[PDB]
């Protein structure tokens, strides 16, 4: 306990209500990501979050909307720690969570993942969004 003004931004930002983030929480979260400080407990807290049980699968849908906008609006260092961090990344590509209504959450960690990954291969497409994104990169 004792969090950081960052600290709560990222975990409110990735909480178990609802799998939407808020558009004022991305944008906080990547002109935080430019602070060293910031960085490291963002992208910590960002570590756990993907690492959770399947019953808190929001938990993991969020932290992986904060990276795709993290890496497409962020600071390069948000690209650099999910090429070190792929492998959970990659694992949740074949995420699975069918909840007490038998309906497929999964498929939205799933297609988050799948997301991300294909983003992090097109070195292309990263880069020119990354231009257009972030004056003056």
């Excluded at 306990?1 to 609802?18: C, E, H, K």
């Excluded at 961090?85 to 960690?109: A, P, S």
């Amino acid at each position: 306990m004792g969090s950081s003004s960052t600290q709560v931004l990222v975990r409110n930002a990735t909480s178990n209500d609802n799998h939407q983030v808020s558009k004022d929480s991305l944008i906080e979260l990547a002109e935080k990501s430019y602070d060293s400080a910031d960085f490291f407990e963002i992208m910590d807290m960002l570590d756990k979050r993907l690492n959770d049980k399947g019953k808190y699968w929001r938990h993991i849908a969020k932290a992986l909307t904060v990276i795709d906008y993290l890496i497409r609006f962020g600071s390069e260092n948000c690209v650099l720690w999910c090429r070190e961090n792929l492998y959970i990344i990659k694992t949740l590509k074949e995420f699975r969570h069918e909840d007490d209504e038998g309906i497929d959450q999964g498929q939205i960690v799933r297609v988050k993942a799948k997301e991300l990954t294909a983003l992090l291969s097109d070195d292309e497409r990263l880069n020119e969004e990354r231009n257009m994104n972030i004056k003056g990169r």
